[PDB]
Design a protein around this ligand. Sequence first.
Ligand code: ADP
Lengths: 49, 49
Amino acid sequence: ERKYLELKSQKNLYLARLKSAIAAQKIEEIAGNLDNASASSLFERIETK
Amino acid sequence: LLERLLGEMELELIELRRALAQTIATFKSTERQRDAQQLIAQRWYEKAQ
Ligand SMILES: Nc1ncnc2c1ncn2[C@@H]1O[C@H](COP(=O)(O)OP(=O)(O)O)[C@@H](O)[C@H]1O
């Protein structure tokens, strides 16, 4: 009983940490850096267009 | 076949125009990236100043 309670007391923290990292990664593919010029960042693709 | 060839060659000519447009676009992009790099170098020189 106590072991199960302990695991349930941490599942939420682990999920939050995973979601924050996913969103942080999803930032970069859009803008990244201003001098990125990779044609992968969505702003440079519009600029060349 | 004279008319067929003339229409096909019209298509080829507009295709060449589009290709040249893309080429000049990429040239402009490379020019901009060079300017950004020299700007960063100037910033570092000013920092050392
Ligand atoms: N610190 C940095 N400063 C400037 N540009 C960077 C930096 N790090 C990465 N880049 C940019 O990343 C680009 C390479 O991305 P790209 O090769 O298109 O991605 P992929 O490897 O998926 O094809 C380069 O054009 C470079 O300008």
